[PDB]
Subunit: 292 residues, 4 copies
């Protein structure tokens, strides 16, 4: 089930930049306790960009193991070469992950036909459920509703993580896909609006440090208690924004460390330690949300 | 050396998507005869995106081999993880390439401080000249003149391929760097304007098929004969545009096939075959350039 | 009451470019019959830009007269000089119009403080209800939520026509204003989404030629029957878009003439007659909506 | 005549927002002494927006009177209704002005065909030289090079003030027009780059306060001495930017007051007094330019 508050979980690292298992276990336990619906392992927020495919796989398998059946795990499987997307997706075949989150090729800027071919080929080499992921500001590429429509016709392409923040997409996509195709926000600041328009949940950065509020907000939203959800949202909104005061996941990793959830806020270059001014910004926002 | 018309050469492939050595030979001879200044190997137009680092290195080594000292070769060495940039660069230590073209990290959207640390670390791990590469439309990331200025103080950071098409950047960068830092256009359509404002040459997609004209145009511009250079540019202008009618390098690979310069116009997914409408727009552009 | 489907009514002209009273009467009767909630007289769609203030006033007074108490009339009162906004607003004082629609100054690009001062001064010279109007693509100016908040504190500033198509504004504005402040869409293509997020109606261009469907859609929306409303919307959507195939109100005036609702589709320069290709586009869209 | 440094002169006002003749005299003498090429009267920087057409005409006539044949005067004649453009232009028939500066219609967003018909009709109703004026950020409308090309075929359409800051426009326009059509920058910050690409001068806000430097810089550029011109430009550059730290002409009116060139820095709403933060940014910029 790909609904509700789904965390794009940080990959906690030791001071050397390698996965820290104690901190991962702790984060996973926190999400199990907190009511988080599922975990996305090595998405954008999990530093897919700076992990090689072996390291990437190690983190996913380790996340799966530690989740220990208590919470479903979705593997990030994006690559800008179709052959590499297939090959990464194959690692997780018959593994216990429940689906894949797969981003539009970045940098090489395919046509809509190229995007169609890319995702169709990936979905054909797998039985795993596929969630498409559109994030033009990172990729240089925009997966348009008409093409989500085409791809939704492939049996195991089952959802989209829509990160544009362009709310008109929720109903442009909905009208082109079956009732069971799932529409997830990839933008925390607009994700409650997204759900109010008919979206089914959010793949959240905010949920890393505010898992309980996020899960409650998404459940309120799903029950149509939009006014009640919005009280939570307005408490989380400074966070929704300030977790991007510097490049994700620089802010949210610091926040995790500040909350005692991870041992170190280490990232891999080209991500750099949070600035002193970033700290104070994110600290303010944690306080506003009643977490500090 | 890093001046004039520098070709971002296509990586010619057989029907199976593998580097075609015989086609790479025709192309490399074509540039030796046409007065091209240097060859950028496995840049963007070279399908850096869809070559794994070992195929990437192959193509660079084969290019060096075939060029046989007749024309200098620059390796594309861009990666969005600093560690991977460094280890890619180290691949080409002692290789015979004259420098590296290294793009801002794509997808992960580092700060300017992160770009600084990225490029600094890369330059620290090599003796080869480094040409920075800014192309925000592909990367999600914009390397700003103030950061180019800091980086230009590093001994072997010697130039920038500036591909925004924002021509105010020429003299913003030029103000901040020494007289020997090279400013190269990475946008054919605005490259003559770029040179006329003080740029030193172009890393060119058009040069793939219009090598002699590109070489003459850039020499005229270097001499200050802008009116005469502009005459050539106006013939090339449709080509400058239509080589991007569908994602690069789809149109320019097709153009090379149509001229007999490569055996097939095959690309790797997510790049897809040229459309019929595209064929006709490109063929017209080539005729306008007097090339067919 | 400033809710439901509110038409931004064309100013029908004879072949000389002067208001045509027979066609105006006919349009007003059509809106009375059709269930249209209120009329906005000489807004953008009513060619405020090419009417002088005397002509502007004549059309408003004539519209009021013909409405004959059957349907409320809102006067467009925008001007980019505060003195002229006040002076136009004064014409309609004690006239029988029920409120004013007043746009952000265009061309001169005021600060948010300037916007505050502008609207506060206008509201102070009148007892009439004020609906602010934000349309950055026409004005060069963007009235932000925080400033709508400030102005909403002025007694007779009672609503906003929000034309950005940026749906995040609905709840950013809502959380800053009292429950009785009215949020109206100024963008037909996103207006049902706007209402689903908490908006109270739409100031519509589409409603000119599809008044009955629009009024029904808005009533469904207000009752929370969003799925039912959307069937209507999807029938109207080609219209929502193609009424801007050429600059408004060129398309919608042709459509009015095609439907027999006005005698001529004459506009004032710089608006030009619909192109033959525009005709066919708008005709297609009228057919899709079941109006032709 | 329509070359070099042309000043978009402020309209100096007393405390009551009325044209101050004594201040207009100081300014006009300042430009005669500083070698300014010509004076644009009641352009954008001249508060065209908030002057009614009769005050507008006054200020133009007073400017002509005070200039006393010592420096040529161009009238701003822009209006978004073609009829109003024509009747404004006819106001200045036989007046002594040397030409007109006429902006694309703002707010109503005409097609390119509409812009054509607009400017054609205006040029047909006068013998005075017409300088087109493109500034999309204010108007919502972009007059494209292909339409400039058509219009340049009209006898008395002799030039363009191009204010996009998009420098590719210089030679796109230049390709399409005769050698005697003038291309003028309407963007100070990029005006030297503009001239270096082939532009003939600048209609300048900076010239209000840096007249002698602006005149020298433009003469050097006209002579091809770009390095020497650039030295001046780099001193002026903070001023080029900070004169737009708050909406034009708020900062430049304040600068004029601070230099003693005008008695008050009063503006008309919706322009508001300069902030204290603005004061300090401008004062610093003026010191950097060596003007204080
Ligand atoms: Cl995005
Ligand atoms: Cl770019
Ligand atoms: Cl530019
Ligand atoms: Cl807008
Ligand atoms: Cl939106
Ligand atoms: Cl502009
Ligand atoms: K990676
Ligand atoms: K499916
Ligand atoms: K690659
Ligand atoms: K250097
Ligand atoms: K008007
Ligand atoms: K109020
Ligand atoms: K005016
Ligand atoms: K002419």
């Amino acid at each position: 089930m790909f609904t509700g508050s789904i965390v794009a979980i940080v990959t906690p690292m030791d001071e050397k930049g390698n996965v820290c298992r104690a901190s991962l276990k702790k984060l996973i336990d926190y999400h199990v306790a907190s009511g988080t619906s599922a975990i996305v392992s090595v998405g954008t927020t999990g530093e897919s960009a700076t992990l090689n495919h072996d390291e990437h796989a190690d983190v996913v398998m380790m996340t799966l193991d530690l989740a220990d059946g208590r919470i479903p795990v979705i593997a990030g499987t994006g690559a800008n070469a179709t052959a590499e997307a297939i090959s990464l997706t194959q690692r997780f075949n018959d593994s216990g992950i429940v689906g894949c989150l797969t981003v539009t090729p970045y940098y090489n800027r395919p046509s809509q036909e190229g995007l169609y071919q890319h995702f169709k080929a990936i979905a054909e080499h797998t039985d795993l459920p596929q969630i498409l992921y559109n994030v033009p500001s990172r990729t240089g590429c925009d997966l348009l509703p008409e093409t989500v429509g085409r791809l939704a016709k492939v049996k195991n392409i089952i959802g989209i993580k829509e990160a544009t923040g362009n709310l008109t997409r929720v109903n442009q996509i909905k009208e082109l896909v079956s009732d069971d195709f799932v529409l997830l926000s990839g933008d925390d600041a607009s994700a409650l609006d997204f759900m109010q328009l008919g979206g089914h949940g959010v793949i959240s950065v905010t949920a890393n440090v505010a898992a309980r509020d996020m899960a409650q907000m998404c459940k309120l939203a799903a029950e149509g208690h939009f006014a009640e959800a919005r009280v939570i949202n307005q408490r989380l909104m400074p966070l929704h924004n300030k977790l991007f005061v510097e490049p994700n996941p620089i802010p949210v990793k610091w926040a995790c460390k500040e909350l005692g959830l991870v041992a170190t806020d280490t990232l891999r270059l080209p991500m750099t330690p949070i600035t002193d001014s970033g700290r104070e910004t994110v600290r303010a926002a944690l306080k506003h949300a009643g977490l500090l």
